[model samples]
Target: MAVPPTYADLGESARDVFTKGYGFGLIKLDLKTKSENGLEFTSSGSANTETTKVNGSLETKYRWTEYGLTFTEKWNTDNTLGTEITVEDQLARGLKLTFDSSFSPNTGKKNAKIKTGYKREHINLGCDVDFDIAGPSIRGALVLGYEGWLAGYQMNFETSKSRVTQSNFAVGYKTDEFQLHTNVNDGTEFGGSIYQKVNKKLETAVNLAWTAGNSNTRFGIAAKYQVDPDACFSAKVNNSSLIGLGYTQTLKPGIKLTLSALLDGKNVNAGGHKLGLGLEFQA
Candidate 1:
């Protein structure tokens, strides 16, 4: 049983957490553009040392009054290519439907999936079915919310096996300055988190979890500080003796930068130091 971190574990880095398995990599670019006529285009390309490979994708989306269409093509250094096409429609008020099909030319593998959802004032429901070369699977969720309280349940079922493989339940509540959330997964792992706003620019949070049939309990705490409108900082510490620090800076209107560091605070040498930096450009 893999016991995951609680909300407090993420501490002050909840909003801008570090990427898993951090390593040095070349700067990657993602570009997107939109036209006034409901047409959008996106492309992202990246090359790195460890993989010594180039990968990219080009995607286009066009929307009409009630329906939309999307197409994406992906390629890699190995000359492998994959294609995806999706269509979505707004069937009625509070109702929508979507279908997606994807295929890899190199592997001759294909998949088709459909999803539908409905939303009302206080109730929401959604479901999806996927058919791939291997088998078929179904997943869905239902949620209810009113004012400051919300509850939801979700499940994943294998159609060919005729059994539910995974399920979870979650509930949360929020008020002016306080928030609480709890969740249980597969009835084996449980976790809860709380957040409090100390003042206009300071916030604190805690997270707790018990997993592996109570064999282990995890805890964490975080604090966030807004230095000004253009900069913010956060720090978090967890029971595992891992500490994280992060900073965000808005260089100017369309450009932003983020830096984060993680360090081990334990004597067991269970964790190593890691640093990451990210930049975003928008027009």
Candidate 2:
């Protein structure tokens, strides 16, 4: 089926490489056309200036088990780091207790949209659990996370803060000929997607999602066709003028190549497409 992959950044794991376990990491580079079109936010004819950000980030992840506990870490540019710990049941169907925390350095301050100062401290916490089902062929997880921004992060010097909380759930099923998967999120967002395989070489999916406390509804259709066992091509079209195509290929045991091109209704530039190579290793 046309399965959407996990969006978790690759560098979310740490300590696993040396903690008696297996894990890997990847590095990515992208080149694309940049856009900095500002927005119109006033009726009195006030205009805005838009700036574009173009940069590269190095990411890493690792995990390991020790004394019935698991630990992982992931880090990315903008000085963001996340750490997680888990407790597992060794002699049960399958159960895990997971807790994670995140730290981010906001050189422009967490409230840059409204603030003018620069700061460095923002933190978030997250936790989740998964129980095995269908003999581990299928499993589901539920997670909750929250991030806090301090008062000095904004334009106002008042002692105030802002917090964001998120919840997510996911399930997957695999078989020799096909696979199926689904995911949902709540809090500031409410949405889900599902996939079904049609055969050994082709698959399709449809998704419907909505933004919480808002009137935005998103609908999408996607498909992927296998050209070779080690490579595939994919495309997706949806509302909001979103249309894109991409390809994935395994370059080696721990290396991969990805290419993608897309349009968002305004431009059709060649640099709108991107090529990326990744490397992973374990000891």
Candidate 3:
């Protein structure tokens, strides 16, 4: 119940804040609907890049509770069609099993995976096997927590190659008001981040990333502010001269709007600025 996060979510909080701020140079509209019969639908459209291209997508999902199964299908403007089928069930108190498959009609490609996840008071573990025709791969990870300290490791093995191809390591420490996390991805790139809850209405974070052989080290900082119960603002900047800001407001109970802007800090006098607008409605 109080275990550490799994490998896939090792540094999710910091990553989400630094990477998901502004959608530059885009205009988007979205509609989502859910029915009483366990069905969900979404439709979205976008036009960007000086009106050179227009894109749209439709997605539908259904949940079948009797068998603990779910089905999802999607179609996009670029002739890509995809679907996913999944079955998830619990085995015992702390164990769960999931079977999943994804298929693409346009490319005639399919992927299948089976996974088991277990969690306890201080330990979390997960293992999965991919049964793709190209090559079957196996992956496993485990995280241990003790007194607010966390450590984890993950690796992927290729059956055809008979060797481990990718390895990652992660460590973190967290408290009620502060968090520090670091990860070495694929044994090549290293990154670290710190998050601070300044107050009830403001949060700030900083991150640094560098590769093994690259000379440039990236440094980034971000902050999020809760303007009110229905409005929010976020801003982020990086050492490479990138700045972005975003604002979100809820007009009604289920309707929302977002505005964003991006600027080139180094070339302030040039023409490298972008703006985005988005509207969303849910029912």
Candidate 4:
């Protein structure tokens, strides 16, 4: 049986073509390097026009025995921050565990959570539990796949209410040149995405979604063109008449850059289009 995409990633390829690296809402910077002693370090920062705060994160990874250990910390220009530790394959093959805690001190509990997952050839599953003194919440999910087809479901159960509070499902088929996916979210919103590789240099995608009780229907169509080996351009338009354009360039080996713009087709004179920039360095 051919391996299928994970449950959470059933429709992600189509979404990625339209949203990934398009950074239209944030300005981002990233740096990554590995030490001779086998520790890998990564740092990144992002900022948006609506906030004066710059969000930053620091992370490190190391391989110990057959396990992969990673630590991450995130902070804002303000005082709120959080830390997380993830162990990959520490207990068994295809198993991972993550523990997260936050130092943010307002309007909520001092947050903590444990999330775990296991994946294999035909099945994948995961669980999440919130750490609280009482009335904690938990989530569970599972997916099964074979021969390029997949089906998955997830649910959130509230301990306080002792009931299922949220649920989602997806089914998809994937192959080398085409992918089709359909999903239901919150039991009401219906959506699907399609991705097609037109040729060696041109790829295209489309997405459509609508809610059960809502009268509004939303859709987007996008295309990407590879202009040689180091340059790429992409563009998309949605039902709301918003246009997004992006360009990505690889400068030499370890440096890459991207620029994006979000424009309102209906408001040409508004002149407040959102622009984004990103740069990455690796060594």
Instruction: Please report the candidate that would top lDDT against the real structure.
Output: 3
- Model 1, 1-283: lDDT tens per residue? 1111222222223333222212234334456675646667767665554456666666666656345555555554444554555554445555656777766666576678877776666677788889876679998888776786777788899977899998988887766678777888888898677878789998877787888666779888777788989888878878888877777788987666766667887643454465555565555
Worst 10 residues of 1 by lDDT: 1-10
- Model 2, global lDDT: 0.39
Q: Candidate 1 vs candidate 4: which has greater TM-score?
A: 4
Worst 10 residues of 3 by lDDT: 84-93
Q: Evaluate all candidate structures by whole-model CA lDDT and list the values in order.
A: 0.66, 0.39, 0.83, 0.82
Candidates' RMSD to native: 6.2, 17.3, 2.5, 2.7
| Model 1 TM-score (2 dp) | 0.76
- What does candidate 3 score on TM? 0.88
Cα-based TM-score, every candidate: 0.76, 0.46, 0.88, 0.87
Tell how far residue 279 is off in model 3, in angstroms.
Answer: 1.8
Q: How do the candidates rank by TM-score, highest first?
A: 3, 4, 1, 2
Instruction: For residues 177-240, write the lDDT of model 4, one tens digit per residue.
Output: 8989889989799989999988999888999999999998999899999996988999999999
Clashes of 4: 0
Residue 257, candidate 4: Cα error in Å is 2.0
Off by over 4 Å in 3: 34-37, 64-68, 85-89, 213-215
